Amino acid sequence: TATVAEQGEDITSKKDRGVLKIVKRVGNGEETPMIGDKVYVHYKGKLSNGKKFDSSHDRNEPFVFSLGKGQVIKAWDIGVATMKKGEICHLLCKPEYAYGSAGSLPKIPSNATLFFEIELLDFKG
Protein backbone atom coordinates (compact mmCIF):
# COMPACT_ATOMS: atom_id res chain seq x y z
CA THR A 1 0.00 0.00 0.00
CA ALA A 2 2.86 2.40 0.88
CA THR A 3 4.67 2.05 -2.49
CA VAL A 4 1.61 2.72 -4.72
CA ALA A 5 0.70 5.55 -2.28
CA GLU A 6 4.20 7.02 -2.77
CA GLN A 7 4.83 6.20 -6.45
CA GLY A 8 1.33 5.64 -7.93
CA GLU A 9 -0.05 7.78 -10.75
CA ASP A 10 -3.18 9.74 -9.89
CA ILE A 11 -5.65 8.76 -12.62
CA THR A 12 -8.63 10.71 -11.24
CA SER A 13 -9.94 13.74 -13.14
CA LYS A 14 -10.12 15.75 -9.88
CA LYS A 15 -6.50 14.94 -8.95
CA ASP A 16 -7.54 14.12 -5.35
CA ARG A 17 -5.22 11.02 -5.19
CA GLY A 18 -8.47 8.99 -5.06
CA VAL A 19 -7.21 6.27 -7.41
CA LEU A 20 -3.45 5.63 -7.71
CA LYS A 21 -2.05 3.19 -10.31
CA ILE A 22 1.18 1.20 -10.83
CA VAL A 23 1.59 -1.07 -13.84
CA LYS A 24 3.07 -4.47 -12.83
CA ARG A 25 2.94 -6.25 -16.18
CA VAL A 26 2.62 -4.57 -19.56
CA GLY A 27 -0.26 -5.64 -21.81
CA ASN A 28 -0.39 -6.55 -25.51
CA GLY A 29 -1.38 -3.98 -28.11
CA GLU A 30 -2.05 -0.32 -27.38
CA GLU A 31 -5.86 -0.43 -27.18
CA THR A 32 -7.76 0.21 -23.95
CA PRO A 33 -11.44 -0.65 -23.48
CA MET A 34 -14.20 1.80 -24.45
CA ILE A 35 -17.19 2.62 -22.26
CA GLY A 36 -19.79 -0.18 -22.69
CA ASP A 37 -17.16 -2.77 -23.64
CA LYS A 38 -17.53 -6.01 -21.80
CA VAL A 39 -14.39 -6.42 -19.68
CA TYR A 40 -13.11 -9.65 -18.19
CA VAL A 41 -10.80 -9.40 -15.15
CA HIS A 42 -9.05 -11.45 -12.51
CA TYR A 43 -8.43 -9.59 -9.29
CA LYS A 44 -7.25 -9.75 -5.69
CA GLY A 45 -8.49 -7.16 -3.20
CA LYS A 46 -6.98 -6.34 0.18
CA LEU A 47 -7.60 -3.74 2.88
CA SER A 48 -4.80 -1.26 3.82
CA ASN A 49 -3.67 -3.58 6.59
CA GLY A 50 -3.13 -6.26 3.91
CA LYS A 51 -6.12 -8.45 4.87
CA LYS A 52 -7.87 -10.05 1.89
CA PHE A 53 -11.53 -9.12 1.33
CA ASP A 54 -12.13 -10.80 -2.05
CA SER A 55 -10.67 -12.50 -5.10
CA SER A 56 -11.97 -13.90 -8.39
CA HIS A 57 -9.42 -16.71 -7.92
CA ASP A 58 -11.51 -18.30 -5.13
CA ARG A 59 -13.83 -19.90 -7.73
CA ASN A 60 -11.35 -19.11 -10.47
CA GLU A 61 -13.99 -17.53 -12.62
CA PRO A 62 -13.18 -14.19 -14.19
CA PHE A 63 -15.21 -11.18 -13.09
CA VAL A 64 -17.17 -9.70 -16.00
CA PHE A 65 -18.73 -6.23 -16.29
CA SER A 66 -19.58 -3.51 -18.82
CA LEU A 67 -17.07 -0.66 -18.56
CA GLY A 68 -18.37 2.69 -17.27
CA LYS A 69 -21.84 1.58 -16.31
CA GLY A 70 -21.44 1.83 -12.52
CA GLN A 71 -21.59 -1.98 -12.12
CA VAL A 72 -18.43 -1.80 -10.03
CA ILE A 73 -16.81 0.74 -7.72
CA LYS A 74 -15.79 4.07 -9.27
CA ALA A 75 -12.09 3.18 -8.97
CA TRP A 76 -12.59 0.21 -11.29
CA ASP A 77 -14.58 2.12 -13.96
CA ILE A 78 -11.76 4.66 -13.90
CA GLY A 79 -8.81 2.27 -13.59
CA VAL A 80 -9.82 -0.53 -15.92
CA ALA A 81 -10.40 2.09 -18.71
CA THR A 82 -6.62 2.80 -18.54
CA MET A 83 -5.53 -0.85 -18.98
CA LYS A 84 -4.32 -2.74 -22.06
CA LYS A 85 -5.24 -6.38 -22.82
CA GLY A 86 -3.19 -8.75 -20.63
CA GLU A 87 -2.01 -5.91 -18.38
CA ILE A 88 -1.69 -6.41 -14.61
CA CYS A 89 -1.81 -3.30 -12.43
CA HIS A 90 -2.12 -2.30 -8.78
CA LEU A 91 -4.76 0.27 -7.80
CA LEU A 92 -5.02 2.11 -4.45
CA CYS A 93 -8.56 3.39 -3.97
CA LYS A 94 -9.71 5.90 -1.40
CA PRO A 95 -13.20 5.32 0.04
CA GLU A 96 -14.83 8.03 -2.10
CA TYR A 97 -13.94 5.85 -5.12
CA ALA A 98 -15.02 2.59 -3.51
CA TYR A 99 -17.52 1.91 -0.65
CA GLY A 100 -17.40 5.29 1.17
CA SER A 101 -18.74 5.73 4.70
CA ALA A 102 -21.22 2.82 4.27
CA GLY A 103 -18.42 0.27 3.71
CA SER A 104 -19.48 -3.27 2.66
CA LEU A 105 -19.81 -4.91 6.04
CA PRO A 106 -18.46 -7.06 7.51
CA LYS A 107 -15.74 -7.58 4.85
CA ILE A 108 -15.08 -3.90 4.18
CA PRO A 109 -15.20 -1.34 6.99
CA SER A 110 -16.46 2.25 6.81
CA ASN A 111 -13.98 4.65 5.13
CA ALA A 112 -11.76 1.87 3.84
CA THR A 113 -8.94 2.48 1.42
CA LEU A 114 -8.74 -0.56 -0.87
CA PHE A 115 -5.82 -2.17 -2.66
CA PHE A 116 -6.42 -4.22 -5.85
CA GLU A 117 -4.27 -6.29 -8.15
CA ILE A 118 -6.18 -6.47 -11.42
CA GLU A 119 -5.40 -8.44 -14.58
CA LEU A 120 -7.31 -7.33 -17.67
CA LEU A 121 -7.92 -10.67 -19.44
CA ASP A 122 -9.91 -9.41 -22.42
CA PHE A 123 -12.47 -6.88 -23.58
CA LYS A 124 -15.17 -6.95 -26.30
CA GLY A 125 -17.52 -4.34 -27.82
Side-chain angles (χ1 to χ4, degrees), residues 20-34:
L20 295 175
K21 177 177 172 200
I22 298 183
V23 172
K24 307 309 289 172
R25 184 179 79 191
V26 69
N28 55 80
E30 331 270 45
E31 297 74 32
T32 62
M34 318 253 66

Side-chain angles (χ1 to χ4, degrees), residues 13-42:
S13 67
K14 286 179 160 162
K15 302 302 172 195
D16 54 13
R17 298 202 103 240
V19 181
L20 295 175
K21 177 177 172 200
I22 298 183
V23 172
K24 307 309 289 172
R25 184 179 79 191
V26 69
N28 55 80
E30 331 270 45
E31 297 74 32
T32 62
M34 318 253 66
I35 296 184
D37 280 352
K38 297 292 311 189
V39 300
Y40 296 78
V41 303
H42 262 313

Side-chain angles (χ1 to χ4, degrees), residues 1-5 8-105:
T1 287
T3 146
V4 52
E9 179 184 350
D10 189 343
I11 60 173
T12 68
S13 67
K14 286 179 160 162
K15 302 302 172 195
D16 54 13
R17 298 202 103 240
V19 181
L20 295 175
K21 177 177 172 200
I22 298 183
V23 172
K24 307 309 289 172
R25 184 179 79 191
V26 69
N28 55 80
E30 331 270 45
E31 297 74 32
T32 62
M34 318 253 66
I35 296 184
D37 280 352
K38 297 292 311 189
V39 300
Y40 296 78
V41 303
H42 262 313
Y43 72 95
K44 293 177 177 176
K46 304 189 313 152
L47 302 179
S48 287
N49 59 19
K51 183 171 210 137
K52 176 180 179 190
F53 62 81
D54 221 76
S55 175
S56 57
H57 302 276
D58 292 4
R59 280 179 164 167
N60 224 269
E61 304 171 6
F63 187 95
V64 189
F65 66 103
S66 61
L67 189 64
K69 290 201 192 164
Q71 296 179 347
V72 290
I73 56 170
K74 291 170 164 149
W76 277 34
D77 271 342
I78 295 160
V80 176
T82 73
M83 295 180 72
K84 295 173 183 53
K85 184 171 160 176
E87 181 176 311
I88 302 167
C89 81
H90 286 169
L91 291 176
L92 187 65
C93 307
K94 293 191 165 281
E96 19 291 316
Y97 290 88
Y99 297 99
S101 63
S104 185
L105 298 156

